[PDB]
Design a protein around this ligand. Structure first.
Ligand code: LYN
Length: 325
């Protein structure tokens, strides 16, 4: 029998609320990743199979005290089938869990974490964001957060916006969300309507698996959405989040800066610049998120062989592109 369990929404939902989760836990409702529950029943590893190589999405979910156990069991179970195990988008404070198994780390980027309490558009340099907000407020756009269950009529209106936003592009997966009705029923959906009540944009609000932190997964808008649409949505989102009592917002991962000062090869360099599309949501520009003055939280790739790092990145990139062969 193949390693891991079939993705089960009911079991996952029960687990994430009774044991807790992380930033990438909600992505398990896409049904495109296999699950590996620990024998303790307190920890969970989500992953995807690519040939003889398994790619884990993030750190384990659940009780952190069972994290060494689930990693031990998962790696052992993969040792039997002779599979290579890769960990994608883990955090620094959990490096000790993987270092003992001889894993190396590579910084993929940083997540923009915006303080909702100290965020404002009243700043002297915040004249740009305040102008965008005022214009949307002037033209009569309204922001609303809807709760599941959602009707077909509502989903149809979201699909029209989504399809128009996608264009000729197809959906990505694994570490990114896509338009699935089952998945969309699992969380609140925030919409932006015009004066005529026409939905021109939508976002799905991702569950609190931390302190007072929230985030979104999908952010899509139609062609009739005004310029600065993405900036406007985050402003409305931050306003709503602060109103609900949330402390922080995760704007998703952004590419690293040029550091400022080598293990760099031409192989690795070409792969990374090719990759700048599949790992950074909303905008591939770090400056887009940086202007919100966020606290950067690094995400790392856990690998074993350094010479196989360029290939590893390609396999993960294609996995996000929904191809495993
Ligand atoms: N999951 C997301 O961030 C979606 N808003 C876009 C994914 C497909 C991009 N071509």
């Amino acid at each position: 029998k193949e390693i891991g369990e079939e993705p089960d929404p009911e079991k996952l939902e029960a687990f994430l609320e009774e044991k807790g989760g992380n930033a990438l836990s909600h992505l398990g409702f896409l049904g495109d990743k296999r699950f590996f529950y620990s024998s303790d029943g307190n920890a969970l590893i989500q992953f995807a199979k690519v040939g003889q190589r398994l790619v884990v999405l993030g750190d384990p979910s659940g009780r952190e005290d069972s994290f060494p156990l689930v990693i031990k069991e998962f790696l052992h179970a993969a040792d039997q089938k002779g599979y290579l195990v890769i960990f994608y988008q883990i955090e620094r404070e959990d490096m000790a869990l993987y270092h003992d198994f001889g894993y190396r780390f590579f910084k993929l980027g940083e997540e923009a974490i915006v303080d909702l309490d100290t965020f404002t558009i009243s700043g002297k340099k915040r004249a740009g964001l305040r102008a965008i907000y005022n214009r949307f407020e002037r033209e009569g756009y309204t922001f609303h957060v809807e709760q599941p269950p959602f009707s077909r009529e509502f989903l149809n209106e979201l699909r029209q916006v989504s399809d128009e936003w996608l264009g000729r592009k197809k959906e990505k997966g694994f570490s990114l969300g896509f338009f699935q009705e089952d998945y969309l029923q699992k969380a609140p959906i925030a919409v932006l309507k015009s004066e005529e009540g026409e939905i021109v944009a939508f976002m799905n609000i991702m569950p609190m698996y931390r302190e007072g932190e929230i985030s979104i997964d999908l952010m899509r808008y139609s062609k009739k959405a005004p310029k600065g649409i993405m900036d406007a949505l985050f402003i409305y989102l931050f306003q709503w989040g602060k109103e609900q009592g949330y402390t922080a917002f995760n704007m998703g991962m952004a590419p690293l800066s040029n550091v400022g000062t080598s293990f760099w090869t031409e192989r690795l360099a070409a792969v990374i610049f090719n990759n700048v599309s599949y790992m950074y949501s909303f905008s591939g520009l770090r400056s887009f998120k940086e202007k919100y003055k966020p606290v950067w939280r690094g995400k790392y790739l856990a690998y074993r062989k350094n010479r196989s790092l360029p290939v590893t990145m390609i396999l993960v990139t294609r996995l996000i592109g929904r191809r495993t062969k």
